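yo

u said u wanted the structure for the complex thing, so here. seqs first:
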Amino acid sequence: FVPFEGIKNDLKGRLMCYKQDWTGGFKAGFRILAPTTYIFFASAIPVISFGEQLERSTDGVLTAVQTLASTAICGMIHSIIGGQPLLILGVAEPTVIMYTFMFNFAKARPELGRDLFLAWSGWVCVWTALMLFVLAICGACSIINRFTRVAGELFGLLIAMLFMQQAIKGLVDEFRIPERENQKLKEFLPSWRFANGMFALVLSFGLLLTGLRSRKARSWRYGTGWLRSLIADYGVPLMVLVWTGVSYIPAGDVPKGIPRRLFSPNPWSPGATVVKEMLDVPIVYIIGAFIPASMIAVLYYFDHSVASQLAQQKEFNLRKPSSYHYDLLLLGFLTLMCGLLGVPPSNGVIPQSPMHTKSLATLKYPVEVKEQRVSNLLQSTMVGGCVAAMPILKMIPTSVLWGYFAFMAIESLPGNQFWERILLLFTAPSRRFKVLEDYHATFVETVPFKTIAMFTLFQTTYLLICFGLTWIPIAGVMFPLMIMFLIPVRQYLLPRFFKGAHLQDLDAAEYEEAPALPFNLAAETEIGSTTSYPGDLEILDEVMTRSRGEFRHT
Amino acid sequence: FVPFEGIKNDLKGRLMCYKQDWTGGFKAGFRILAPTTYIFFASAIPVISFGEQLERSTDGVLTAVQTLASTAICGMIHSIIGGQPLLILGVAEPTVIMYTFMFNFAKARPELGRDLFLAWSGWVCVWTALMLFVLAICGACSIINRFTRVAGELFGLLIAMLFMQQAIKGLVDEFRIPERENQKLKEFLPSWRFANGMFALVLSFGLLLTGLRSRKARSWRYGTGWLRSLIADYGVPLMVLVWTGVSYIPAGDVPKGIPRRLFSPNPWSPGATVVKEMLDVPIVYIIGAFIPASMIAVLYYFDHSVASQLAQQKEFNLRKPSSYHYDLLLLGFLTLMCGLLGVPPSNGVIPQSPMHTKSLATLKYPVEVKEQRVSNLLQSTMVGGCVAAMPILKMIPTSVLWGYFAFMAIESLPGNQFWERILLLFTAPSRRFKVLEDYHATFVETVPFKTIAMFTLFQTTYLLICFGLTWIPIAGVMFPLMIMFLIPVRQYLLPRFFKGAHLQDLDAAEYEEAPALPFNLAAETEIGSTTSYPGDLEILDEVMTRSRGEFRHT
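structre next:
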């Protein structure tokens, strides 16, 4: 923990491969565009959704323009002078939540008001930048190995709950009159409002289901290989386009605002730095900005490091070193810059960074990764240029973005062991052999069910407490502290209540999986020892055709 | 083919087990109610849907009241005096189509008009009854073994296409003003009409998807066994109830007719036999009724026999004889009675009869079937009593019935080999090993792909020709002739173009299935000999988690 040692080591390591980082990207030629486009589409749409969320939550002060600008600028700067170019930067949901809390606080205090919200946010960002500078200089990133699975999975599930909550919020509001819209317009009559709500439901559910189906296109037996890969890679943008086109079908027989589209304004229109107002903020609020700044700093310290770790998995066989400390220092600088510019800060995002690394990976028949700084720069520049295309983006209905919120919420589940343990907890005792009949985690076999249930119950109680805390108007800005507390809890308290190898299996740094077992071997296990024989109708369901009731002979 | 021999033999066989048929049903006690309720729900809902279809297609002359009455009366009479009580009778889609054609013909001729449509239908039914009497007496049912798989599967797919067409028709019409409704009502304004259409889409798709998911409840690892069985058995009615309740949520904030509900009237209201009008029909049209009567007779001769055969599969180990000839004679009598009463005739339906037989089956650990006349009588009586509950049924939105049409259309596919062969035809050559990786038909392995493709192409051309014929205003009443022609075609022409065992495998009276093969054994086959290796992204998709991009270790 010697000051500046980590930064110096990271700079020394990354300075011997800079020219190579650029030349290798240039040597790839036009073939570097496919990963670039894939990651650009993976990054832009969630940023636009977060921008719309902020527009609804900040009374129009912050919109998709600011989120896109922050993402683009931070990504380009990180690509040019950052340590780990594989890391993808963008505006994340926790930042949106914290800024919503800050806006709610500012609006209720006349001394600040809506006019000084951005200035107070800039002071908050200054404090956060100082905190990140201190953390990077003191080598606090040397203990990221303690960011274990429990905290990461709990945070992921919490963000999934927030995503689904926002989706429900938006769909409900689609049935209502917007707060800052002319109430006398024809589109806001009860009949047209009801029609807009139902159309929003249709579009959102179509987007969600079609994207979920498209995610597994490469396993299909239909079409060409290139078409299957294209669908599996770009189903989200493709489905967004398809459902926008669907939304435009009745355009001629309905008012202008049916269905509702993005509220974010076009910056090109004449109607449309905050350091000048930062001076007008009272000193008391400048000092008090330390409070949310610490929470934002904790959030960034966790998320940046976790995303970089995931992007730098040993299975990728990366030949270049890591830059955790210098990356955190640069994140502090970027947060300061974004706070001064009046845009929300950006940080490492998941699963965008590992997806980028995967897109840059090939198998030599054994993983080889094309690591360079060109793809990140190009995708950030495209995200920035999307601002110039705001008129085109404004054609997207908001219901599609709410459906995308639900899509991310559901897509956070698959690889999450906490979710799987919850499902096992709510699984019937007599049907756990079904769990053993497919791919399953190793702790299912190597740990008793009672210990798993107890661990899952503790984790679920913690998660629900944090989610409820998020609902408190002011104290809800403190949930990063609860997330951080899981480190010392796991390190000290859990070993008292849990026996070693059990914690190691339930809190393993590696995702361990086991193959499906035969029915005979699934009953000798303790967990599957209570198997129950199938009923007559259950048996007949499988041996008879549903179309005509024909007996199947095998 | 000696006249009356089949009828006498069937009566002799069924007269030695009549008292037993009744006593065994009584001895079952209250445990006979579960199959009765299951089959009653399987029968009533499609009948109501067909009634609504007729109401829209017959300008309100025929409704769900008539269909329910016909189903109930025919079922009770068949149960009491029929030969095979396992056979379930009801109004089917082909009858609806033929009656729609007849109504369209009658409306355009002033000599008949809408006032004599039911009388002309009664004369048609008289002709059909005479035709069925002749067929039963001449022993035409002795050649039902020639009703091979090709014709049955083609007919099933044709009915599925008609179901989906009706579903699309109803959903489109939900956006429009009904022909016979007051156009000045508030619910028929463009805004409320658009809202009704979107609400209909939501309800229909929800019903369809939820029912499809519920059909496989018994394989779940959640809930109790009884709850899983209840869902798997009654998902359709349960989902209908759930989505009706959903439809009633905004009742207080929308006009009366939002969403639209069943148009069929309540017979209890004061506003509400046709032999008197049968005399007023011109002799020329009485003679000309012979034309549609022959087609209806062909349809019934096919469907009754096929349904009875499916309900009397040898795997059920039924200990009582068959009554094909007497059943056809009784069907003729029932058709005459229904024509006189002014209701559409009922006939054997699929898969209701095999589902009933399955519901009456238990395994003795080996199938034993409780064959009796009580379940059919009770379910028919309940279908009849549903008429008295018309006010309750009128609460069902029509969008739910259109969704049910789509549900039946999709549920006709699973066990259909013609559909599977179509899918294989449109399958990519390099991805047939995927077909071989799961349960598959035996002809996939035992027949070359070229022969399968040629057979499927011929069958598809025939099916499309019949479907297009259904669209011709008058000549479309002739599609049963095309269905019948498949018997001599299969018997004489196909052997010229196909080599024996190939036809036997592709047109087998038994549903032969083969288990999944290992990848190594899936490539040595001719069909799977063009396997292509997976790509890098395809490989990485399976070994990396979607939530966080974590490498899976197995």
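Chain B touches chain A through 84 residues (CB under 8 Å). The first helix of chain B runs from residue 5 to 15.
cya
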